[PDB]
Amino acid sequence: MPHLFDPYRIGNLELANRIAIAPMCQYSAQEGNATDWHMIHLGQMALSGAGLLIIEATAVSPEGRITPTDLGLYNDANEAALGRVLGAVRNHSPIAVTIQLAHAGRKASSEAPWDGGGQIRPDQPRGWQTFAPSAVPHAAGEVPPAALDKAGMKKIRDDFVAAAKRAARLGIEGIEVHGAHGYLLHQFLSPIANHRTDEYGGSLENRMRFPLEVFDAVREAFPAERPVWMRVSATDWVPNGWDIEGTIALSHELKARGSAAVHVSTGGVSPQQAIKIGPGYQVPYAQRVKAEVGLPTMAVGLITEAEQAEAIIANNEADIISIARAMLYDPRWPWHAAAKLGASVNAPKQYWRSQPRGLEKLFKDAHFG
Amino acid sequence: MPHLFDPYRIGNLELANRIAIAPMCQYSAQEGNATDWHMIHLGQMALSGAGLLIIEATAVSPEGRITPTDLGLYNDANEAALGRVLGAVRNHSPIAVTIQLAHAGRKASSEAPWDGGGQIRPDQPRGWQTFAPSAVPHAAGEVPPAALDKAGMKKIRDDFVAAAKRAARLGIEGIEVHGAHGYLLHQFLSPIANHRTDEYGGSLENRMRFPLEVFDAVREAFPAERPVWMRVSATDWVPNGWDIEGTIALSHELKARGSAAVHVSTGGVSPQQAIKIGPGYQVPYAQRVKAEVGLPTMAVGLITEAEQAEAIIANNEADIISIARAMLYDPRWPWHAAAKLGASVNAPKQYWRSQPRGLEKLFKDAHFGQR
Numbered sequence A: 001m002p003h004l005f006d007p008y009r010i011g012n013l014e015l016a017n018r019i020a021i022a023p024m025c026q027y028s029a030q031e032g033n034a035t036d037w038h039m040i041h042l043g044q045m046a047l048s049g050a051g052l053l054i055i056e057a058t059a060v061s062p063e064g065r066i067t068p069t070d071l072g073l074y075n076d077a078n079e080a081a082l083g084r085v086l087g088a089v090r091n092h093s094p095i096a097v098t099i100q101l102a103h104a105g106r107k108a109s110s111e112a113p114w115d116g117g118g119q120i121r122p123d124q125p126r127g128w129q130t131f132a133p134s135a136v137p138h139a140a141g142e143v144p145p146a147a148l149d150k151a152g153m154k155k156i157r158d159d160f161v162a163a164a165k166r167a168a169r170l171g172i173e174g175i176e177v178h179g180a181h182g183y184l185l186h187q188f189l190s191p192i193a194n195h196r197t198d199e200y201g202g203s204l205e206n207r208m209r210f211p212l213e214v215f216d217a218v219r220e221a222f223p224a225e226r227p228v229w230m231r232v233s234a235t236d237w238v239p240n241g242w243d244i245e246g247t248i249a250l251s252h253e254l255k256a257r258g259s260a261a262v263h264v265s266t267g268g269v270s271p272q273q274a275i276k277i278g279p280g281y282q283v284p285y286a287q288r289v290k291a292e293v294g295l296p297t298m299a300v301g302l303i304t305e306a307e308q309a310e311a312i313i314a315n316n317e318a319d320i321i322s323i324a325r326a327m328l329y330d331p332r333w334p335w336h337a338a339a340k341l342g343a344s345v346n347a348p349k350q351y352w353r354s355q356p357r358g359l360e361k362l363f364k365d366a367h368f369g
Numbered sequence B: 001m002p003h004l005f006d007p008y009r010i011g012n013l014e015l016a017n018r019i020a021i022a023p024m025c026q027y028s029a030q031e032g033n034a035t036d037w038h039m040i041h042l043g044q045m046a047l048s049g050a051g052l053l054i055i056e057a058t059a060v061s062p063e064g065r066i067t068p069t070d071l072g073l074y075n076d077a078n079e080a081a082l083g084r085v086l087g088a089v090r091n092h093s094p095i096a097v098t099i100q101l102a103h104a105g106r107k108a109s110s111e112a113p114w115d116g117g118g119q120i121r122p123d124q125p126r127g128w129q130t131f132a133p134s135a136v137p138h139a140a141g142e143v144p145p146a147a148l149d150k151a152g153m154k155k156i157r158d159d160f161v162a163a164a165k166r167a168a169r170l171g172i173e174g175i176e177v178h179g180a181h182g183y184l185l186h187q188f189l190s191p192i193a194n195h196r197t198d199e200y201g202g203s204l205e206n207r208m209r210f211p212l213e214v215f216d217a218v219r220e221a222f223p224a225e226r227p228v229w230m231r232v233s234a235t236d237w238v239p240n241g242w243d244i245e246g247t248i249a250l251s252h253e254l255k256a257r258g259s260a261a262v263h264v265s266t267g268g269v270s271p272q273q274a275i276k277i278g279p280g281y282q283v284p285y286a287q288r289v290k291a292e293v294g295l296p297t298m299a300v301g302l303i304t305e306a307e308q309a310e311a312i313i314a315n316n317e318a319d320i321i322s323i324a325r326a327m328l329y330d331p332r333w334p335w336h337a338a339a340k341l342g343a344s345v346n347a348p349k350q351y352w353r354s355q356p357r358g359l360e361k362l363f364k365d366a367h368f369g370q371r
């Protein structure tokens, strides 16, 4: 009889409950460096009582950023800036802190969403040359990426390794390899983006080959006891693209290769995607991945209500509920869920006076004697 | 026909709406210095879409702190530490940032709430000698404060002035002088704490004299264009103390002396109690101070729902509503209120995608595109 507020575990990392704060790009870094925005944002996310925080898509190289203001972990300055933020978080919260390591591939060199998200060309001041499995653009008329060669692919492997080591040194507790949302690894997985005719394209085994090498490299580099997993897009929502069968096959391989979990999202590789959006619309993909592969499975997508979240766990549809927008709109979401479902959470002492009367057990360890 | 989400103004300071974030002690400073907590906390508060943020009780001297971990503005280090927090706020928020300047008087040298809130004796670790209008402890068996002399009262005036100048140099946009919660100024106001026989105790005029000296000194020191006001307790719960008549007389004096507002605490009557009595105002004392004195009247609102706050404004009970606990339990309270009331709010661009599926146009001037 599983419940949202059961303690849980991914690999050896104990989680206070099944609630994860999904990775959410803030587009507020400067040359990859965390800024005051990140102390405010991650600081507040850490007070939420969620069991797990997944830091935003963190670029393994400058050219792997989505946008010029993405968070990075590709040099010592980036490491020190993020370390300042993490020190503050650890000072005020017991949350498990993990990080999503990322490379945008052909979707790199973009504007922030509030600036319309368009491609910035390599010839424009903030733009740069992008890389992908094949020299085909994400959308028609865009400046195409260069097709990766052997040394290019090695650089990416080595950059993921280097970033995973910096993350380890910072005391980060886990790594989510970004394999979703139309970014570099997903580009290799999907026949929409991957037109290669070497051993990294064509067949399913070939298309999975580089994403799995990247996974393996990170898993080797990161301390063995701390979990490493992948976020996947379960489908492209485009006929003949990546689909749930590819996802299941990849998930089996991830399990065989020591992944701690699979975080199941969808979409991102094609402007043609025909997404059927609605509450819990991506839960069926997580349910199937959980059923067939049996790794800890995180579900996400328009999960906004405590009873909805609880129902997903109760129905064995996922093991972890990932929440993004509902956390931005209510950074106390897990407190509020705990109040509705008769549970407790960790909260900073500064805010112990804050809950309504009648919820005297809501905050673990709270006292005033 | 006023509404919660109408723009408003205090002095020259334009406010996006009638929602103020109440000064809420965090007990998280080190020798008066703001810490990483204040960055995280004040950063959230500043991004809430409220019109006005009032920084917590900020000690004018170490001896004037409520606790050993109160926020202070009494030396250069205090100033620099707060400046770091404010600079982050300014990078990200359009909110008006103001500060409550404070001195705890006989209630100083106490523990934080999670440590039981007790007095720390002058001879214990972290403790210190407290000061007050008279040598009478807040509670029996506590170490009494020293009764202030002419020099001690001058130090306090000058400390308020010094802190007000530091606040101005930090670019803080307004000052709330703390005359409530049984702290130093309230101790002078109240015959319960003030047993002085000189020109500072006895009659109502004598009891208001030092609080009004402090207010005047702050108003003189702080840039004339920026608002300065006082926080006042509507009434004591006990007889022969401070009362609603005193509050009204003090609010008239504040107006004549160039106060921008008055911020009226509840006098111990919550909305749950108040709405059952008489006309059923939620903030009856604030309502009366507004009607009789005509200053911009901020009322402490012990409320959680948008509809409660709207009604306070729409029923002419207050011009600005300050919100404390509901802001801690929901730092997006003004977003949630705006959604209920059909209004919009300033939200940081980083969070514009958070708008629920139901809603549209919640966030002012939001735009989105993605490849």
Ligand SMILES: Cc1cc2nc3c(=O)[nH]c(=O)nc-3n(C[C@H](O)[C@H](O)[C@H](O)COP(=O)(O)O)c2cc1C
Residues within 6 Å of the ligand: A022, A023, A024, A025, A026, A056, A057, A100, A178, A180, A181, A231, A265, A300, A301, A302, A303, A322, A323, A324, A325, A326, B350, B353, B354
């Ligand atoms: C502002 C914002 C930033 C995001 N950044 C990332 C990211 O860095 N990495 C990622 O895998 N997904 C990212 N996503 C997708 C979310 O993690 C999540 O999967 C998606 O928003 C659906 O969940 P929700 O309905 O709970 O918001 C982001 C979403 C938003 C709204």
